[PDB]
């Protein structure tokens, strides 16, 4: 009958890059989901396969709180059946996704005047990600028939680029913190309720 550590994910001081997203595993606790959604602090709080208000009266075997940072333009892609550089090469939601996507603008916390290049995304990859695939390989992307052997140049580029977050960027070019709550099923016993 312990309360869930949702505060530890949502209110975490530093978040992750989107290609290297986190999976805090939630287990054995009570979650007041209605405390989270009435927060009215989110520019995006869009579930799928379940209702936000009916969520309090429910249970699951495991809740997975995935959290990362992207731009506001790409928030649309944190959804089932999306394309784009984030949806394809960084974080992919299944077409049978049954959780919630939550996002809020982070330009105050996550942007430095000289430019904050701490956050990153994956720009080059030979094929799309499987659902919930995390790819942290920094291997020089090969574009030609000629292999790279860890030496940049023509047809041989670093697979990762950097977000350029400045407080004067456009609102879409601004950083948005995303938290993705994935819900499983029963058959196996449940540990998270409300």
């Amino acid at each position: 009958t312990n309360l869930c550590p949702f505060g530890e994910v949502f209110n975490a001081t530093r978040f992750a890059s989107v290609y290297a997203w986190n999976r805090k595993r939630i287990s054995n606790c009570v979650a007041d989901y209605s405390v989270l959604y009435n927060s009215a602090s989110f520019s995006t709080f869009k579930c799928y396969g379940v209702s936000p208000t009916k969520l309090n009266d429910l249970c699951f075997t495991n809740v997975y709180a995935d959290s990362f940072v992207i731009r506001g333009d790409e928030v649309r892609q944190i959804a089932p059946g999306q394309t784009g550089k984030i949806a394809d090469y960084n974080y992919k939601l299944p077409d049978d996704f049954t959780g919630c996507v939550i996002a809020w603008n982070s330009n105050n916390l996550d942007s430095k005047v000289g430019g904050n290049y701490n956050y990153l995304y994956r720009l080059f990859r030979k094929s799309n990600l499987k659902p919930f695939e995390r790819d942290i390989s920094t291997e020089i992307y090969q574009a030609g028939s000629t292999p790279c052997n860890g030496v940049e140049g023509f047809n041989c580029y670093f697979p990762l680029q950097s977000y350029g977050f400045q407080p004067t960027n456009g609102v879409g070019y601004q950083p948005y913190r995303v938290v993705v709550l994935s819900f499983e099923l029963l058959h196996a016993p449940a540990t998270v309720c409300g």
Partner: antibody
Amino acid sequence: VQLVQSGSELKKPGASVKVSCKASGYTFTTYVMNWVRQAPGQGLEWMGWINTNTGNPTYAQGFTGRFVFSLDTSVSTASLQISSLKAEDTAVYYCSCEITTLGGMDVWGQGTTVTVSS
Amino acid sequence: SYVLTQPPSVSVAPGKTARITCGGNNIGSKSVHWYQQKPGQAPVLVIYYDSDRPSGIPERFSGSNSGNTATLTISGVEAGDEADYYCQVWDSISDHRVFGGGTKLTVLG
């Protein structure tokens, strides 16, 4: 990605020492630098971090007063300076980089051993 | 600051499952990470995020974290798995990370 540290140091009590940590392979200022201490027969003990961007250092309770995290972005090198060495400062010191608190402490130097004996 | 409690030594037979516990005040609420330091070498990350495996670690390594103890479980214990094992947590608000006391795994081989 590579982290290479300075060689073994020997000092009398009350002396000073500065351990360097040259990096290579990535952008030095992108990722936080972290320092960890391991005394003989003990375990790893987190010392703190210096933000390689703003320069702001964080010292956990127990390493305040005599330690100085500094940087030299020109050579992609962080440095650890200790003032007024004590016998209990004798340990192996590691520089390690957090990508994030994800792969946190995911690249480590080979270690610099520091012995303080009178 | 925060406190982490490891068993100092654990004895397991070759091939069997070794279990190392990591105690802490409500540690299933945070993310635990496990390291493996052979004598004379730098620490190496074997499990981050309670259970997630880095690329290159054998499938034998799997983690756990709930309640107040994380649990590092090594599946097929091999002769080369003798080393010290530390558990580390990072505090979200404090931004401090805290290490444990260590655990010397000995193979009864």
